[PDB]
Amino acid sequence: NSNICEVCNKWGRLFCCDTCPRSFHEHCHIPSVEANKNPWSCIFCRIKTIQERCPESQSGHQESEVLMRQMLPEEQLKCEFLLLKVYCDSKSCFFASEPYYNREGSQGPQKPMWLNKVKTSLNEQMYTRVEGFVQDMRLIFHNHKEFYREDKFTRLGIQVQDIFEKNFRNIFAIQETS
Ligand SMILES: [Zn+2]
Ligand SMILES: [Zn+2]
Ligand SMILES: [Zn+2]
């Protein structure tokens, strides 16, 4: 197994996947690494199994259809994995914890949002459809763009949103377009 966490790339108290060489800190994995379970399979392995059991699940889909799916176990897992893929980027640190807004010439957003809030919402089963999760994720970046206006720091939102969107298209097998 790897000697660093797959998400944050640090050593520490790591839990090792039994079906692949990845390792994780307890709370870097999503969901948090389960108490018992030997063997243990990580989220990457669990997603791969879904695909293998239903190869047709990789045929292209319309975003509008994906968003209306109810959050049954497989869609729950896919959203957890997509959230994890965002945390895998180091620029996610800017969006992880609760923001505050006091900048000359800007007003804070009406509905603040952050990664750890989405993480909690998923843990507590607060989303009934994929749309709920995707709307909160996109709102993180939209709030950032709006608040930072022409400061070059706005680009961090564009960057992390692009990681989100690329992974959303991959995980939910959105039909490729130009
Ligand atoms: Zn970690
Ligand atoms: Zn694994
Ligand atoms: Zn099948």
Query: What is the phi-psi region of residue 154: left when phi exceeds 0, alpha when psi lies from -120 to 50, beta otherwise?
Result: alpha
Count the residues in the chain. Answer: 178
R_g of the chain, CA atoms, integer Å: 17
> Rounded to an integer, what distance in angstroms lies between the CA atom of residue 130 and that of residue 69?
6
Ligand approaching nearest to the C-alpha of 42: 2
Give the residue carrying structure tokens 């800007």.
Answer: 106
Ligand approaching nearest to the C-alpha of 52: 3
> Rounded to an integer, what distance in angstroms lies between the CA atom of residue 38 and that of residue 137?
33
Q: What are the extents of the domains in the chain? A: 1-59, 60-178
Q: So what's the architecture of 60-178 in CATH?
A: Up-down Bundle (1.20)
Ligand approaching nearest to the C-alpha of 17: 2
> Rounded to an integer, what distance in angstroms lies between the CA atom of residue 99 and that of residue 101?
7
Distance 62 CA to ligand 3 centre (A): 19
The verdict on domain 1-59 having CATH code 3.40.50.300 is no
Distance 27 CA to ligand 1 centre (A): 7
Which candidate, 49, 107, 36, 128, places its Cα nearest to that of 81? Answer: 49
> Rounded to an integer, what distance in angstroms lies between the CA atom of residue 168 and that of residue 151?
27
Distance 66 CA to ligand 1 centre (A): 30
